[PDB]
Design a protein around this ligand. Structure first.
Ligand SMILES: O=C(O)c1cc(O)c2ccccc2c1O
Ligand SMILES: O=C(O)c1cc(O)c2ccccc2c1O
Ligand SMILES: O=C(O)c1cc(O)c2ccccc2c1O
Lengths: 516, 519, 514
């Protein structure tokens, strides 16, 4: 009955592309849980159990963005809906395929908040398990057809806009699917196409933010790329050089969210802005977005005096940051961010906390080509980054495992503030039988704050003892140790603490601004 | 004045966005937008329609949107006025109609304070609406007049790009709430503040036409030249891709190995009966992100199909024979039937149709009765509220579609008579939406509208002088026999007229059983 | 099967006080349609069917406010929820016990957003499990849940009545003896006292949903029509600008009359809001305090009482004289005529635009008569069917008195725009109940307080009633009183044409005469 339909949707979930499922122990959602662990024992899926329902949501977000695959979370309590709120809100604004699973009880009379209405791509409730053995083969099709609907809506198969989905199974040999493990209803990924005429030769600077696509025809133009954005060309432009120049056009890739000059440039009424997104949503600053497109058709090529003015200032800004950082006495988050950037090698995965770390890496001018950079930029919360990295590693390392290469699994390196660490410190607690990453190292830049009693809050938390209590490898190191100790393999998961200073950081940026 | 500057700006961008008609319902909080709309109508930039009842006003907008294809905006005040658009918004959702509900509201600061005519307005429609966008309360800040304009125009384009499906390929209703307590110019050349070019959603799919395949064309289906030769059971509101029709009654008598499902087929229990048959694979080809669960065995979904081979000529001859067999059963029993029924009048209307006409059907019986008579849709624009298939607003939707089709013809510049718009509705739907006939003297009236009502008890009792209704709203009405329908429809008359045909609902079961028995 | 659940759910409604259920035919069969038919045939409930879903909801509102009992609406279509919106919003803002019935089938899923904002509670019964042994306890939970719906609808525990959504998913088990409800919940006594000094010059503004306060009977009170009067010292609304009250007592939820809002929004006048429910209104946040009753200190200054009564008389005369001096027949004249024709025990239903204001200007005395208006949202829709429902519930309660005297007449004064809005509500099948003493007075003027501001429609109201087989007469104002006394059909209308052009001149004369 109920268990027959639990096993069938799990088979179709795997067929649809689901590889990892997150789960919290609770009273409800027992039959679906058993069908999951049946598949986890077999090895068709990998199961992850956590106590904290909040961090499980972010863990699922990590598993999703790690390999770009749909990930499920199993709700088993009345607290789970509220706790998964933060993760579901991120998955909505970051377009992360997150399938939230529930088991409502329909034979009882008549909790849930209203964010499910605003955040979720589709709230789909399956039918009740029926005692109609003659019709079960007919009930199979709808169960597998409905499961394809939540998979298509989560991955944005027809909308080109991935996001979270609410899947509800009511609760009072398995029927086979199609041959060759194919999904019941196969919908190929849609190609969302919308061209836009753009005269390249006009002085153009390209701002690529979160969710940005790659356009090879824009590879030559000078581009200010956020860490999370992929890079189409090899002509970088530092974010701090932007005020020095006065562009006449701006191509906007995705959802840029960083840097005060970017906000003012896109808001300038005299400068027209063209936004190129991969999904139906398009951003605007002060309503200055002039046109929206999937891609741009390009007429001409920019004049090299523009090209060389930008390229010179780009070197001017990068040198000013590199020079002024060396001049500074104490180690700061910008120094720590620069330390991680120099120590990175292609094939790595980089996870950044959504506060200062992502900002600082851009200031350090990190080159991201060959690197996969992940950050919870949809809502920009300081929550759940520890679990996001753990999940990102587990999804990334799992791809290498299936890849079959006999290589050391790629490193996953995370950079988070102390406030981010303490928030999600509970994400470090993992059961012995639950999957644990093999090459994850979380750099914690402790500055006792982020960016006098309220603005910055001191906590005096012993990060080392906290890591010790959860049975994870920790080591307090100085800046120069980072690059060396990152290369040296240790435990599969380790936390590297680096002390930092805030008082000196304020003057440092003034010195950076004075050398420009 | 902030409220008037806001109103005149969002009206300008809506006009720039392709809004040619605007339905308006007057009230206290409606003033700033009502003035802005009047200056746009008096200047000839839009054609405004004032209606008294908001519910039928929303349906008047649906017709204006489907008759030409442009986004239509409606304006009303706070309170029960916006609630009256529930039924219209619900229909626009399932029918993908670019309806911009523009509501004036007392400031949100007053919500919960007990102020008269205020309610939980924003989000009233919930998930039925494509997007609920709220304009900021226009603040007294002339130092930012150049900045407030950009955000106002940028937001209006979002309302327009959402209602028309400019980037989602999924049109539908949008809730635009504006609280209220030289006009700043837009872009040069009259272009939208934020331009959105034509979008394409593409999902090709390998389909083998050699396999015995039938096509089921539903509401909102696209035209696919690859499938023009296949036998298609096409609903009236579905555009026909070819000249190989298949009657729906013929579908159960055939054995297809394959079925292509265009749009959203709703009609016909046999279609639903066949869709559940698992052995036959189903291929759903839609135009937008939505695709129907009417079949549980849907193998795959897409936007278009790439074909391999061609259907066997034996298969084509089999279906054509069955199609002719089903039409003959309908013809023979209808002629053999002594009395005149709702199917009789439905067959008469279809025969009097000529290419270039616009057919508007009551969503319950007429659509079924027209498809059973097997009307040829080619060259004819068939409109019906098939989103929710409610009895509401059929009259107003025919009126708007007439006004939209006629006005679109006047823009062609061709110097001939405006094309006919004739509608077929039952008495029950007619008496319900009788409020829609009421058009003010200054408001646009259709030039060639003929509402054909097929009166019978029901279709529980009601006895109603249909002529007295039309007299109450000053609409010319004559009562006709079934055989005189064609000639009267052929002879043009007033700009808007009603033709009532008395029909009998008793023998409907006797007639239907004969057709099923004649197969 | 599920019919046993349906049979007991209706039984608890009848036990709880439901006496009228409104129904519409639709796409899927009605929730508990069979159980209602038998109760209708047995005479335990009266049943009204309608084709228009929007009219049906407003009809139920009248059925609820006519006598004060909860009323159910059973709706069975995809357009059903959208069409009840306006009536449900009105029920919420007027605190009307309206129950809405649903029957969702939970064996696949995936309704507007107003249901969360408007209904006092949303309860769905458990699906009827097919098990005979546990039906003893299953009867109890069924009847426990139906009482919850009733208690939420009538505000039995919350003192705030309103709309409720009840969903029943798809011999009879007995209730408690003596036909009493399963879960007995008595009407709660919501109490909140407030110290008010009556020595200070105080005026009382009583609006929709106000309560009666005998200790406040002495004060001069500007009372809306739908407000119950608690004293014999009235004060015309047009005397308010000529007075300087140092205190204002706000009974209920006032809406009408510009001067009250100016006085209620005065920063320098303390406003004490006395309500019968948890909600309280404010105008520009000037409500210094809230309560349910007043504990009084002192008495009003006789000079203050003198002046108030003096200005009340002066305002009474100004409108009566300018009404007479004015040549043409305005909407104020028909409103004044209807007011003079009323007799104690009558029921009056007022359209939400000018009629509810105009009868207030004519100085109507509501003592002894029951006044009704859809003031929660002040909507122009559903007025004729609200009157129909009010007349039906009113006559039914009078019929339950058993008295031999003729049923009390229900009179309704509505504008033309409100008439054509709800014209469809007139079509009532012979199968359905029809009022016996309902009289509808239509003040026709092609709009009321210019292509947009006023909508000229030029409708034949006589031909429209002819169409719906309703008795109609186009009389004059002088003859309104006599025709109104002489009884006619159970449902009859009287259309009196009125001019809007002379209105600006007439109101100016009253301003000049004040
Ligand atoms: O392109 C993206 O990835 C993207 C993602 C989002 O979550 C957005 C939310 C609001 C507006 C625009 C958005 C957007 O362009
Ligand atoms: O493509 C369409 O026209 C269309 C439109 C809709 O509103 C639908 C609603 C539910 C299910 C399928 C739908 C569909 O296929
Ligand atoms: O007492 C009433 O009738 C009543 C009714 C309402 O709907 C209110 C809404 C907001 C604030 C006060 C309210 C109020 O006092």
């Amino acid at each position: 009955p109920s268990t027959t339909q639990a096993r069938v949707v799990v088979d179709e979930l795997i067929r649809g592309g689901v590889r990892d499922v997150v789960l919290c122990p609770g009273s409800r959602n027992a039959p679906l849980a058993f069908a999951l662990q049946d598949a986890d024992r077999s090895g068709r899926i990998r199961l992850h159990v956590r106590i904290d329902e909040r961090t499980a949501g972010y863990l699922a977000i990590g598993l999703a963005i790690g390999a770009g695959a749909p990930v499920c979370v199993a709700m088993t309590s009345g607290t789970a809906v509220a706790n998964l709120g933060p993760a579901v809100v991120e998955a909505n604004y970051a377009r992360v395929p997150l399938i939230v699973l529930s088991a409502n009880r329909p034979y009882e009379l008549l909790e849930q908040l209203g964010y499910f209405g605003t955040q979720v791509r589709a709230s789909i409730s399956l039918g009740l398990a029926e005692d109609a053995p003659e019709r079960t083969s007919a009930l199979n099709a709808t169960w597998r057809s409905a499961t394809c609907r939540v998979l298509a809506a989560a991955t944005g198969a027809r909308t080109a806009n991935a996001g979270p989905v609410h899947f509800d199974i009511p609760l009072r040999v398995t029927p086979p699917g199609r041959p060759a493990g194919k999904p019941w209803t196969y919908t190929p990924p849609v190609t969302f196409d919308q061209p836009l005429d753009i005269d390249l030769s006009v002085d153009t600077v390209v701002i690529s933010g979160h969710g940005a696509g790659v356009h090879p025809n824009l590879a030559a133009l000078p581009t200010v790329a956020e860490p999370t954005a992929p890079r189409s060309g090899d002509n970088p432009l530092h974010p701090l050089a932007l005020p020095l120049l006065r562009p006449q056009q701006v191509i906007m890739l995705g959802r840029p969210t960083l840097h005060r000059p970017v906000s003012v440039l896109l808001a300038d009424a005299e400068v027209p802005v063209f936004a190129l997104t991969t999904g139906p949503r398009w951003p605007d600053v002060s309503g200055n977005s002039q046109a929206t497109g999937t891609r741009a058709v390009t007429t001409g090529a920019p004049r090299p005096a523009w090209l060389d003015r930008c390229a010179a200032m780009n070197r001017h800004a990068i040198a000013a940051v590199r020079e002024q950082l060396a001049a500074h006495p104490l180690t700061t988050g910008l120094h720590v961010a620069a330390a991680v950037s120099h120590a990175l090698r292609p094939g790595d995965q980089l996870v950044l906390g959504a506060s200062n770390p992502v900002r600082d890496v851009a200031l350090a001018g990190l080159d991201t080509r060959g690197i996969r950079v992940r950050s919870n930029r949809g809502v920009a919360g300081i929550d759940g980054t520890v679990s996001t990295a753990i999940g990102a590693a587990l999804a990334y390392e799992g791809a290498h495992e299936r890849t079959g290469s006999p290589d050391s699994p790629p490193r996953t390196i995370a950079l988070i503030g102390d406030l981010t660490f303490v928030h999600d410190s509970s994400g470090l607690l993992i059961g012995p039988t639950e999957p644990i990453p093999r090459s994850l190292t979380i750099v914690v830049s402790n500055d006792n704050g982020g960016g006098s009693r309220i603005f910055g809050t001191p906590h005096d938390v012993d990060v080392g003892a906290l890591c010790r209590a959860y049975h994870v490898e920790s080591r307090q190191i100085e800046v120069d140790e980072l690059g060396p100790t990152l290369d040296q393999p240790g435990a599969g998961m380790r936390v590297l603490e680096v002390k930092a200073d805030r008082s000196s950081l304020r003057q440092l940026h003034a010195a950076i601004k004075a050398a420009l």
